[PDB]
Amino acid sequence: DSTSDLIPAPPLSKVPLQQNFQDNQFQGKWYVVGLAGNAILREDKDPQKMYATIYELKEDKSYNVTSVLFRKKKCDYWIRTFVPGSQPGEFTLGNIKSYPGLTSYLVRVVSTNYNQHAMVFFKKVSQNREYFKITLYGRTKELTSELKENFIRFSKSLGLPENHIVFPVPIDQCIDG
Ligand SMILES: O=C(NCCCN(CCCCN(CCCNC(=O)c1cccc(=O)n1O)C(=O)c1cccc(=O)n1O)C(=O)c1cccc(=O)n1O)c1cccc(=O)n1O
Numbered sequence: 016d017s018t019s020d021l022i023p024a025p026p027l028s029k030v031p032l033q034q035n036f037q038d039n040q041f042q043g044k045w046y047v048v049g050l051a052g053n054a055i056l057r058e059d060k061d062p063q064k065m066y067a068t069i070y071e072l073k074e075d076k077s078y079n080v081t082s083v084l085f086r087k088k089k090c091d092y093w094i095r096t097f098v099p100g101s102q103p104g105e106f107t108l109g110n111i112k113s114y115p116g117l118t119s120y121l122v123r124v125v126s127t128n129y130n131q132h133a134m135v136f137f138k139k140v141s142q143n144r145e146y147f148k149i150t151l152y153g154r155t156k157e158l159t160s161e162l163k164e165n166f167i168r169f170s171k172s173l174g175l176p177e178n179h180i181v182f183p184v185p186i187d188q189c190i191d192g
């Protein structure tokens with residue numbers, strides 16, 4: 016039992032897909048350098064820490080995707096599968112039935128140059144609520160003011176105000192394996 020209120024998800028027409036997506040080149044470790052979404056809230060008290068996400072391309076061309084987070088003084092690992100969707104660079108979550116409440120989960124790689132930066136769009140419906148986010152990935156923990164501003168401009172184009180955009184603080188624990 017609850018009430019909640021969310022900024023509506025954008026139409027998918029407003030979310031570009033990276034042209035000629037190269038699944039092999041996208042593999043390896045990415046740091047989460049920016050986050051924006053209808054459940055992202057800039058929280059001064061307890062700032063969001065950076066985490067890392069590792070993409071491994073399997074034989075069947077799905078990804079095994081592993082996120083590594085520092086929480087409660089430990090390294091925490093979240094492993095899931097991205098299954099190729101309706102065009103290259105688009106995916107759905109594998110084994111959706113195994114996640115209670117979850118009815119849909121879409122990933123779309125918006126842009127990347129494979130060896131420095133990427134922006135990836137996610138949309139999920141859980142308990143009948145529609146969440147969306149944009150993740151800014153870096154191959155390193157830093158990215159430029161310019162790239163941050165581009166991410167902010169893109170996020171705003173999807174209806175997000177500035178207080179729904181955060182830049183996680185770089186850390187050294189866990190994520191530099
Ligand atoms: O609104 C979104 N995100 C911002 C709030 C994140 N958060 C606060 C942080 C929680 C900490 N964790 C979660 C790590 C563990 N997770 C899970 O066992 C899990 C299982 C199944 C689906 C799923 O989504 N998760 O996370 C991350 O930091 C983390 C790292 C990497 C990828 C990732 O996805 N997460 O969350 C939430 O509580 C939340 C609210 C609403 C939806 C939602 O999925 N989550 O996780 C969102 C929109 C659309 C797809 C989507 O996956 N997300 O997260």
Ligand SMILES: [Am+3]
Nearest residue numbers: 137139146148
């Ligand atoms: Am999530």
Ligand SMILES: [Cl-]
Nearest residue numbers: 047068082150
């Ligand atoms: Cl991620």
